[PDB]
Amino acid sequence: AKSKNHTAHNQTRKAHRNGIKKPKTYKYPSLKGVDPKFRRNHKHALHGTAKALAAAKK
Amino acid sequence: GIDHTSKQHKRSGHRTAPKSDNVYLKLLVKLYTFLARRTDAPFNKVVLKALFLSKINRPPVSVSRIARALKQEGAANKTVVVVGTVTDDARIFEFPKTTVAALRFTAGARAKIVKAGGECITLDQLAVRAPKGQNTLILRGPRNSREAVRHFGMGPHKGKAPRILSTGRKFERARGRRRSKGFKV
Amino acid sequence: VLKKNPLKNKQVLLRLNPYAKVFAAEKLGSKKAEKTGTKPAAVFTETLKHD
Amino acid sequence: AEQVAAERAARKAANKEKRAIILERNAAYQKEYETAERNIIQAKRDAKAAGSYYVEAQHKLVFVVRIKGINKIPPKPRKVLQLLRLTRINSGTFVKVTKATLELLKLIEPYVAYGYPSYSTIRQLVYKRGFGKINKQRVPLSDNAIIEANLGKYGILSIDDLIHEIITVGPHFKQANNFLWPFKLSNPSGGWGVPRKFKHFIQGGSFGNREEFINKLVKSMN
Amino acid sequence: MAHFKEYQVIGRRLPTESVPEPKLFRMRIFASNEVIAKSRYWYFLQKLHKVKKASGEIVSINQINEAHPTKVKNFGVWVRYDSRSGTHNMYKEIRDVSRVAAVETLYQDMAARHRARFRSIHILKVAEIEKTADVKRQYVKQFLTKDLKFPLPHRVQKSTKTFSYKRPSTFY
Amino acid sequence: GKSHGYRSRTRYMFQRDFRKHGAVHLSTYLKVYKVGDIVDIKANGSIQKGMPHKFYQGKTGVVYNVTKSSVGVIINKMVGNRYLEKRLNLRVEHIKHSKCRQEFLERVKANAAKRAEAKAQGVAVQLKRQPAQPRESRIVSTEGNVPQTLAPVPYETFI
RNA sequence: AAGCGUGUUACCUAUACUCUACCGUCAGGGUUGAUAUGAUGCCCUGACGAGUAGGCAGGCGUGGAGGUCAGUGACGAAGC
RNA sequence: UUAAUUGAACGUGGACAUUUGAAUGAAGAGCUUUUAGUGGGCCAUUUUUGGUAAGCAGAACUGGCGAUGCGGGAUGAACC
RNA sequence: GACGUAAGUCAAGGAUGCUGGCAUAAUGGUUAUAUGCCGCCCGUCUUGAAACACGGACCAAGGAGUCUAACGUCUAUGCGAGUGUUUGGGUGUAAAACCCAUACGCGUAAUGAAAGUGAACGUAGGUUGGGGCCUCGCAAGAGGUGCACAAUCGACCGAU
RNA sequence: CGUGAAAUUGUUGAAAGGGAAGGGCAUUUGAUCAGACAGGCCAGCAUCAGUUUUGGUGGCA
Ligand SMILES: [Mg+2]
Ligand SMILES: [Mg+2]
Ligand SMILES: [Mg+2]
Ligand SMILES: [Mg+2]
Ligand SMILES: [Mg+2]
Ligand SMILES: [Mg+2]
Ligand SMILES: [Mg+2]
Ligand SMILES: [Mg+2]
Ligand SMILES: [Mg+2]
Ligand SMILES: [Mg+2]
Ligand SMILES: [Mg+2]
Ligand SMILES: [Mg+2]
Ligand SMILES: [Mg+2]
Ligand SMILES: [Mg+2]
Ligand SMILES: [Mg+2]
Ligand SMILES: [Mg+2]
Ligand SMILES: [Mg+2]
Ligand SMILES: [Mg+2]
Ligand SMILES: [Mg+2]
Ligand SMILES: [Mg+2]
Ligand SMILES: [Mg+2]
Ligand SMILES: [Mg+2]
Ligand SMILES: [Mg+2]
Ligand SMILES: [Mg+2]
Ligand SMILES: [Mg+2]
Ligand SMILES: [Mg+2]
């Protein structure tokens, strides 16, 4: 026997009953998908700034 | 009729009492309910809420965690407060002399603290000597190192632990876990 | 325990608004305006009565 | 001898000085109101005397009453009505008029009646149906100290100070208006004056902008 | 709406740098109150000039009183109205003591004889006919004959009671 | 049966503009993109490589990666009842700087200058923007501007 | 016209709106050197109350078991 | 990476404050685990496909009935 | 708060004052009946049941999410880098209660198909937050420390 | 042949009854019933308070 094929009826009411949410930004997002050459050199740049600050502060 | 913006009659969802029937715990709660009401020190309200917590929500605090906390500069003479159990840790070979206030001490933890010259104190004696939590260091154990937490949020590419009885070869290490067999998660 | 409405219950009206006593005494709710005698210009009256 | 008398004498004298302050501020407001209204009346007369027209400054404040029930409301009007705090039928609130708010009134016209409230209607509304939102609770004003303890940091020490901030839409209108719990009005005491409410006021119904006739409607409901 | 009221409504486009002091257009509007009069003003300026309520401004609204409320006048009225199948112009004559009640009579007449709602009527013009023999409709012309007098036969008296003991008369 | 290929229903969206076919002008290639730049997505049907899917047409995102010929863009996409982070590899042709960000920076500069000059005098110099306000009162004279207008007009067929 | 078009008022009455009380629920608070011993207590303040499928909570009732009431009972238990 | 501290990314240190950068509201906000039922729908306005049409079949957005009594439409799941 | 110079009073954080009848079926409750208005038969499947859909003539008694092995989340409790006496042994007032050795299980190490190898550069790291605590401040606030937790970049173990 | 329920039934008593009966709210009538005099029941007037409804009249713009 035949029945309903598709409908988006009630779908926005379900979606809104728990408040369609933004993706909750952070400082320092994941560096996923960044260019590997930059990422490799960023590692050494951060290592050097860690040395410089540690020597500066102690 | 009222166009309700918020769910009606919603409970706070926070414990307002220990689920425990321990009479001594309820006496400690009677004490810190008074102190949280009659003082404005935030320490008393924090301890009260910690007194309500469940077991998984008050993990053990190790003596070595306490000793690391005492290595914080300017903290070496602070009364460590643990609303829970303090366990022993043989991985530390030099324990400092300090006063630790906790709900429960293990035999090893108490012996280590006392052998260091320190003191083990109940929360009511802490309330007597530091009514506003003066010079106190509240420590908490690691909540997310529970075995059960490994399995939360399981799914493709999530990298959590599958709920599984037997481990090793033949137990979920095949199609779905390597490209040679279908795909990899 | 009981909301006594100002605008009646003169006592509550005086607990709020101490100026109500001066208002009633000086009849500031029935204040006469000074009789000035300006007259609209002819262009206004003609425009108003225009068909 | 707990020295209750010193506390009582200081506290009564403090009450007298606060009441002297409120008294002189209510007198100044009354001067400001009457001077303003006479200024517009004379300015209209002088423009007519000179062959000109005095275009009265557009109204800065509206009072809005939700006149429609809760069921069967589309979601955009439903959201705007919630943001105007009109969560039930015959609830009313004050809105400061800008483009950002006139567009909201445009979205909720078929569900509300609004217009421009006079001083008398604001006073009677605050005096009879005036409640403050204090620590999430609806508190009857009923005393000036309740207002000063919650809006004194904006310079609002009395119920008349609050009315002044509302009608002369002052720098702290927003704080003062939100402090006021949305007025819960009755049905009109002599009826709505129409056979069918849910047509525009222009069309012979009840809703939409009915600018100065909002005073008669609100007075009947208050 | 105890009756209509006649308002003069003067408005203009909003002034700009290009054109300060615009032209000040004015209409006479028959409306139940100020709000409807202003609405009718904009609705009619909608059809004549490029302007709407948002690009314009109401300079003045003033009620217009009858110069002589207690003088009986013959009014000629030009109306435009929409019937169910098209738009039609007509001219009618109404005898009464004021423009506002003549227009009130006119709306009642249009509703009764043509089922034309206030929605579907434009008052093009109202003007008193200052001379007899310029009156053209016979239903108003019959009332201008010299020494006019008619009886009111079959007077029906209103009874406050439910039962009468007299078997009444309709004399007059 | 149905059809849901990658570029379905893009007949008009990926059109070139009228009399605007051909090679892409060199400005789009000389524009510089840094991480954090806010960019608008509009696909160029001439450049078939590195195209955004049709969902991202008209979407505005943030640059997170810069490569030789392309830019990594983060877009927030409503999937069901939440938003998901999407990362797009788009060549520079399908990308332009968003003028919203440039104009906001202009306001930030102007706020700084106004704050700096206000520190000399005039505390609380109203940095925030305001919604358009109701008009003040005004006097409209009839000198050379006497009101004069007609009534509604009669009906004519015009045909 | 107690019909049709239109206009004006008065008037009728919903579990809706305003105020008051009582019940319950939720929330926010108060209360210990006799809280003039009920602190899962007492008290203050505000808001709220539709409901299938379903979830949860606090209670009521039945057969048997440990403890207590040194409980009831042939001067009448239980059952009806 | 640049011809080249030229840049890139991350930073040390210093300056800025509640009109801190529109309005309105905000009922606490954020977050986690776990598990029920459900996975036949139907109806109204508007958009809309097949069809002469259907109380027909099929989609869009919204509001409803289902799950809902109450006043009104005599009567009636959905209309007011 | 008001009034009064003060005494004190008041309609000012919720009714008092004066007077009468009766003290019983008088008010009230219960019940039968009458009157006005209203009220379709429950249960069930169903988009939709009062249905010309099904089960049900009546009554009593009986009558349907149980126990078990293994397990997930949550909670209580004991002990805690451990934990579990009860297979068994000792003992007993004898299927109870009480006591106990060696093991064994799970945990304290992972990873690789496997052979195998196997966890501190550092105050067990850096950055951003972070309750609480500390110091200075009437306070706001500022500074120090910052457990849990969150994001992120590293370091270490195994595989490649 | 302990107790001895319900369905169903006889008798007596009460009551109602023009094509069902039963039910809800309210009250009348009949029958029936509890408790209190160390204030229990029902009312009336006055001065107030809270919320309202309907009049009269004054002063202003
Ligand atoms: Mg289906
Ligand atoms: Mg009435
Ligand atoms: Mg296609
Ligand atoms: Mg009629
Ligand atoms: Mg309910
Ligand atoms: Mg039993
Ligand atoms: Mg017996
Ligand atoms: Mg099914
Ligand atoms: Mg169903
Ligand atoms: Mg109806
Ligand atoms: Mg009908
Ligand atoms: Mg109906
Ligand atoms: Mg009776
Ligand atoms: Mg019926
Ligand atoms: Mg069927
Ligand atoms: Mg049924
Ligand atoms: Mg069947
Ligand atoms: Mg059968
Ligand atoms: Mg059977
Ligand atoms: Mg049974
Ligand atoms: Mg027997
Ligand atoms: Mg027998
Ligand atoms: Mg029987
Ligand atoms: Mg018969
Ligand atoms: Mg009956
Ligand atoms: Mg009264």
Automatic annotation (TrEMBL), chain E:
Entry-linked Gene3D superfamilies: 3.10.20.10
InterPro entries on file: Ribosomal_eL20, Ribosomal_eL20_dom, Ribosomal_eL20_eukaryotes
Pfam families: Ribosomal_L18A
UniProt KW Ribonucleoprotein keyword: yes
GO terms of molecular function: structural constituent of ribosome
GO BP terms: translation
Sequence intervals crossing the membrane: none
Subunit structure, interactors included: Component of the large ribosomal subunit (LSU). Mature yeast ribosomes consist of a small (40S) and a large (60S) subunit. The 40S small subunit contains 1 molecule of ribosomal RNA (18S rRNA) and 33 different proteins (encoded by 57 genes). The large 60S subunit contains 3 rRNA molecules (25S, 5.8S and 5S rRNA) and 46 different proteins (encoded by 81 genes). eL20 forms multiple interactions with RNA and proteins in the central protuberance, connecting components of core functional centers that are located far apart.
Family named by the database record: Belongs to the eukaryotic ribosomal protein eL20 family.
Protein name according to UniProt: 60S ribosomal protein L20
Organism: Saccharomyces cerevisiae (strain RM11-1a) (Baker's yeast)
